[PDB]
Structure 1
Amino acid sequence: MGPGFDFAQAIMKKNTVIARTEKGEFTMLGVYDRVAVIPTHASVGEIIYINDVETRVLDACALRDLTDTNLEITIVKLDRNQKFRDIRHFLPRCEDDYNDAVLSVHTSKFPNMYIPVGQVTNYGFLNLGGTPTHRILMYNFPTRAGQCGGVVTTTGKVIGIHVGGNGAQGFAAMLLHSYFTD
């Protein structure tokens, strides 16, 4: 509908796949080469389905901060025959607050879904499903089951992936440039 939705659509059309684990179907953001991200609660194993095709997992790393606190991001390298467009230059370098964000989801249940969530707070600490979690972003939208792994963007920046909600608020794990240096 406007330039926020334009940037979100550009990311969804080229840099997402549908990932399926034994814990469900997730929006999955491809970042560069064969490297993608997914919430850690997806419980990625040795094999994952990517757009309903059986795919070997070459590596999977559940990220934690240097205090050994959960960040809820798993970086996955996929045995896929095709690379993602490199979007690392759209990743923030530091923790921050944002205006006018969009949450975008693409699954069998929610295809081509875009939600204007408004202001995004650097919330920081969250007890997420009983697990102490750091680097959480918060938005005042009543997000639902099926949105996990959804991509949070502003114009020109990919800032996080949706990891949970409390019925009134939604929560995303930060994406930082420093996670994807090679």
Structure 2
Amino acid sequence: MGPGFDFAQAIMKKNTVIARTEKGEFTMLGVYDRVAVIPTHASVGEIIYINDVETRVLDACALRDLTDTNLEITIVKLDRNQKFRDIRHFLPRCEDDYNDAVLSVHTSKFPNMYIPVGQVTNYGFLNLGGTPTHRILMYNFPTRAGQCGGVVTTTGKVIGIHVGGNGAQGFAAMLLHSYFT
């Protein structure tokens, strides 16, 4: 309906796939080449379904910071016959706070879903399902089951992926440029 939704749509239409693991269906953001991200709680194995196609996982890495704390991001390399558009130049270099974000989801359950979540706080530490987690972003929107992996964008930047919520607030894991060099 406006410039925030326009940037979010441009990312969803070219840089997302529907990923299915034994833990359910997730929005999955493709970043470059055959490299994508998904929340670590999706529990990626040797085989994943991508848009309902059986796909071999060539490599998967659950990121942790240098303090050996969970970041809740898993980087996956897919055995797919097509590259993603390279969107690494839309990733922030540093931890930050942001105005006016959109959370965008695409699954069987929630196709073509765009949520104006508003201001985004560099929250930092979160006990996420009992797991100490760093580099969390927070927004005051009552996000729901089925939005995990959703892409958080501002106009011009891809800043995080949705990893959880408490009924009032939603939480995203930061995407940083340095994860994808």
TM-score, normalised by the number of residues in structure 1: 0.99
Report the CA distance between 1:155 and its aligned residue: 0.3
Structure 1 residue 137, shift from structure 2 partner: 0.0
How far apart are residue 14 of structure 1 and its match?
A: 0.1
In 1, the alpha carbon distance for the partners of 2:68 and 2:47 equals 26
Looking at structure 1, the residues matched to 65 and 93 of structure 2 have their Cα atoms a distance apart, in angstroms, of: 15
1:61 deviation in Å?
0.1
Distance 2:99 2:12 in 1: 20
CA–CA distance in structure 1, aligned partners of residues 3 and 138 of structure 2: 22
Aligned residue pairs, count? 181
Matched, 1:32 2:32: yes
Deviations 1:14-46 (A, max 9, x none): 000000000000000000000000000000000
The Cα of 1:55 is off from its aligned counterpart by 0.1
What's the offset of the Cα at 1:168?
0.2
Cα shift at 1:85: 0.0
Is 1:93 aligned to residue 93 of structure 2? yes
Counterparts of 2:124 and 2:38 in 1: how far apart (Å)? 19
1:81, distance to aligned residue in structure 2 (A):
0.1
Partners of 2:128 and 2:24 in 1: CA distance:
18
Q: Which runs of 5+ in 1 are unaligned?
A: none
**Counterpart in the other structure of 1:103:** 103
Deviation at residue 98 of structure 1 after TM alignment: 0.1
Task: Give the Cα separation in 1 of the matches to 2:126 and 2:24.
Answer: 23
Offset, 1:5: 0.2
Partner of 2:144: 144
Runs of 4+ in 1 over 4 A off after TM superposition: none
The 5 A counterparts of 1:43-122 are 43-122=43-122
Cα root mean square deviation, aligned:
0.1
Q: CA deviation at 1:13?
A: 0.1
Distance 1:123 1:151 in 2: 17
Q: Distance in 1 between matches of 2:47 and 2:68?
A: 26
Shift of 1:103: 0.1
What is the CA distance between 1:166 and its match in structure 2?
0.2
Quick one: distance in 1 between partners of 2:89 and 2:114? 22
SS at 1:119 equivalent: strand
Q: What is the CA distance between 1:131 and its match in structure 2?
A: 0.1
Task: Report Cα offsets for 1:64-102 as digits up to 9, x if no partner.
Answer: 000000000000000000000000000000000000000
Distance 2:96 2:67 in 1: 20
TM-score (norm 2): 1.00
Secondary structure, aligned partner of 1:10: helix
In the alignment, the residues of structure 1 paired with residue 24 and residue 61 of structure 2 have an alpha-carbon distance, to the nearest angstrom, of 19
C-alpha separation in 2, matches of 1:34 and 1:166: 33
Aligned equivalents of 1:4 and 1:33: distance in 2?
26
Unaligned runs of 5+ in 2: none
Instruction: State the shift of 1:116 in Å.
Output: 0.1
